[PDB]
Amino acid sequence: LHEIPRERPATPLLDRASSPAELRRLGEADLETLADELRQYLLYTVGQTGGHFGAGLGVVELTIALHYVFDTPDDRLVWDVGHQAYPHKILTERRELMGTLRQKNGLAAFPRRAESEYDTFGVGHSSTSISAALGMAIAARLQGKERKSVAVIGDGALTAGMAFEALNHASEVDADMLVILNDNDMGGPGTLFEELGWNYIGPIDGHDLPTLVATLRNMRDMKGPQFLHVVTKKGKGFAPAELDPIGYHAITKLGGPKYSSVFGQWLCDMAAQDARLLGITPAMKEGSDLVAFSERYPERYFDVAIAEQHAVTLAAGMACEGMKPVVAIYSTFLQRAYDQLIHDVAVQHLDVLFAIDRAGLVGEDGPTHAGSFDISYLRCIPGMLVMTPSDEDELRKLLTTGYLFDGPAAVRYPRGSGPNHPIDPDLQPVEIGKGVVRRRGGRVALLVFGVQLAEAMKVAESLDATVVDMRFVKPLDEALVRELAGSHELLVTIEENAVMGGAGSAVGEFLASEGLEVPLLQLGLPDYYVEHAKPSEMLAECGLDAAGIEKAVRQRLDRQ
Amino acid sequence: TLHEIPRERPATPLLDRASSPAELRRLGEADLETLADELRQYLLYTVGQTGGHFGAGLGVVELTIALHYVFDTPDDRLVWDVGHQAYPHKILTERRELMGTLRQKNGLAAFPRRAESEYDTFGVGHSSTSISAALGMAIAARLQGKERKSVAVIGDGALTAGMAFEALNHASEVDADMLVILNDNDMSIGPGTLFEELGWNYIGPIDGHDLPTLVATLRNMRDMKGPQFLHVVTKKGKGFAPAELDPIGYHAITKLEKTGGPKYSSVFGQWLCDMAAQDARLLGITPAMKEGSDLVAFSERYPERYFDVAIAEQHAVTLAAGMACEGMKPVVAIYSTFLQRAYDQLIHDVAVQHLDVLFAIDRAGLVGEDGPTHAGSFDISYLRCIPGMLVMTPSDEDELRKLLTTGYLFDGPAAVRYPRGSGPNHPIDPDLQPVEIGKGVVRRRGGRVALLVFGVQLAEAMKVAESLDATVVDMRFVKPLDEALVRELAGSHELLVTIEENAVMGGAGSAVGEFLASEGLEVPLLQLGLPDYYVEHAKPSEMLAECGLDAAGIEKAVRQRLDR
Ligand SMILES: Cc1ncc(Cc2cccc(CCO)c2)c(N)n1
Ligand SMILES: Cc1ncc(Cc2cccc(CCO)c2)c(N)n1
Ligand SMILES: [Mg+2]
Ligand SMILES: [Mg+2]
Ligand SMILES: [Mg+2]
Ligand code: NA
Ligand code: NA
């Protein structure tokens, strides 16, 4: 197919495969035609809603084979990451709900246990599928159940350390489970997995349904750790995607620069000025936007695969020799290198900059990818310099400030673009520990840590509030907070991070320790997992738009 | 091979001539076997004097000599994994006559440490970091045009961690010029197929105690290019027969030549056996810490429900998550400092899904001579900001058992944190019964000052409270917090004091701060806890005093605040 349908294709057989037992009723002769229907409805429905695209086109036949040959949902099927799982959803009672994909109150971006009994594990972060399936298998065995346990994992996901840990452990307990390797990013692998204790079969053609069905059949009942190697084509069945798998990894349905592009430009600009700079990403070159950097400074660019943990200790090692590494990494994925950041960087006070993207609410990918916690989990770590730029110009300057600082520094910023203010093309740092009064008013002061500043300024128009662009969580601008506490009736902290442990709480700690008893209102993300929606809707829910902030401030003021 | 530890200093005229590697490299190969025996004698003596790690260093006496003999250290970079085997390395790097200060306040640290010496390229303690660190130094040196060598020594156990696999793959990708030495002491003297497949030139296994083979092999490999993997085989406790015979007992020892209560970890382990006796669903998981966390008895009684995942904290937690999906009841036994490494798995695979998994967090707080690399300083801070977590802090043995029962019965993610060591030895109710969630326990009614204690500083706080006539609350829960008790005390007292063995920043005391601020309660608030720096190693009692967490420290802080 060469152009995505705009009208609901006719799929009479797929309308008979609404669920795995219904599908299993059909005969193998129909499976190939079913795959044409499925592929077609998928291209259609993702045209309607936008979403992940090329990877699910790659697993159409594999997903049909899997539900054909296995007794789902009693047989446990774990999809790694989940971006490839739209065919799975279409085949598990959610075909007609696909119109809701990634809309508020609609189907989630990934498999989700609460969404369907056919989803055994909520995924999004990669590489968790083997560990989870092994755990389900260890339990089924003790329970004397006879269910099967299958993980479909891609070749990128397999570069992650936890996947190695799971494969080793599965061998240790001689677990009866199947790992299917959906190899698409394409010489001689079998002996490796055999050395790890896994029975290796393959590689087989992942769009050759009769061979998939038969091979799956023989392996369904084999015992112990089984490893099937399947090969697929990303975007299979859609030429524009087969030829551009990067750009068709996700499609939007039929302003200023992105913060990540501001970072990428700062990265090239500093590299041109300082040969010490090294750029590190764990398999997120496009998203963190190291693209130009990687083309212009190839010998100083490191893609460590999906190995967040090694990315960080690697950088500690580089800094030991006087190089200046910059680890580009999303807030949600830095969760996975927390120990390397604490033990290998911060404990040694090594000179490493973390450029933390996707900080705050990330929109439709939902809570598995939210950057809700990095202020809280980093600021309790001694030695960290922790920064929250408010716009594009501030991101450029605080990156420069952290880079030049001799020690560990973190700069957090959101997905998407900003208020599109002017960016100074100089590369100069700003004073560490100092906020910027953006607005002198009275009565109530808004202490903003990050990109809600523009909403705070709108609120302060009507309330004539003081507004501060705090810039630093740690070290906090203690002298400004102390003056503001002595001259206002209310301090209001604002952040796109958990309130619990977050930046407002550092203000709170500082007020308590000096016995300053001024009222404090902490605005931030609440203590729950925010359901997927447009970014603007998640922020409105969390009260971090101008109307939410104004309502909270006015209420607190009316109560004292 | 010896059988007794020397009580006075051995005669080591050749080791006395090898006070640094440069001096060592001026000796001849024919001297090295005698140096090896003198080093071993010295090692036995000085660890007998100070206490410290023992058997693993015995295992690397010959390898350490060979390494500093063949490599141009400190210019050539040597990274020791974990570092508990690195006493022979310190003895040879200008520190021999300092080993009397080992693991003492202001003495040598437990592990290699960059600030301690130019011969330590990387601070270690946690495991499996050496290959990543050495690869980064190899990459940097090459971009700088330096011709220096990069060497990582890693034990067979550390190679079970995922980050070691991630580093072995990436080193292959960049075709790095480095040497990984696998110090394998679970084998005795096929075997390299794994490393060969990951792009590494594999050599061995060789005899890690044959200095002539070690020196010649190392010399050949020093000069080869690309990712080089040398497989060496050593014996636990080599050359000291009691440690060869009992390498668990001789992993570490006390200085040569009072009853107390049971260790918190042993209370935990008893709880685990008792609850497994009653609930066939309970499964116990440890990431290679059976002795430390103390699943020994449980492993023997319930072996089909005991899982040691090796040094694989990350997989430990996701494996629990998958177990909980089939209705089983995993308990992850994991140190606070090591749980740092599975944080993404706890957040994304457990909390986000609200799966019923219990975390028994040992080594909460300061851990003593092992130092800041192992400190359990942050787990209240990094867990309480996570939606869905039930976060508990028992004050003594009976409270620890009660709060393990409470977190288990809870259907959802729950955490119970307790320190190394033993407690104040209060009686322990043999029942298995919970307590109510989110409710503290008033231990003393006084006036003016209320001490809100999260954890095991309660006995010291009681001493202060008796001196001041203060109120004392055993809070039990950081999340959900006993908001009603806190509200009441904030109205009836002039000062609230929180005490916890965790970073003040983001800590349980800050949860009290947040609550007061959100309700507009304006009572003065003094937060006592761990300060914003890495506390240098010392006895636990000395580290607590430094931080203000003994009764003297608490009282001085409180009195000082009351004087304004
Ligand atoms: C732990 C973890 N780290 C990073 C990602 C993002 C990612 C990078 C590369 C490939 C993929 C697969 C499809 O995109 C995902 C993740 N999902 N989980
Ligand atoms: C990440 C990490 N996890 C656990 C340990 C504790 C440990 C378990 C097994 C073997 C060893 C080696 C010597 O004891 C240490 C650690 N050091 N680092
Ligand atoms: Mg892939
Ligand atoms: Mg070992
Ligand atoms: Mg011992
Ligand atoms: Na600016
Ligand atoms: Na160095």
Numbering used by the authors:
A (entry chain D): 33 to 218, 239 to 306, 317 to 622
B (entry chain A): 32 to 220, 240 to 307, 315 to 621
What's written in the study?
1-Deoxy-D-xylulose-5-phosphate synthase (DXPS) catalyzes the first rate-limiting step of the MEP pathway. The enzyme is responsible for the formation of 1-deoxy-D-xylulose 5-phosphate (DXP) by condensation of pyruvate and glyceraldehyde 3-phosphate (D-GAP) in the presence of thiamine diphosphate (ThDP), Figure 1. DXP, in and of itself, is an important metabolite in not only the biosynthesis of isoprenoid precursors but also in vitamin B1 (thiamine) and vitamin B6 (pyridoxine) biosynthesis. Native MS data on paDXPS confirmed that the enzyme exists as a dimer in solution, which is consistent with the crystallographic results and suggests that the dimer is the biological unit in vivo.
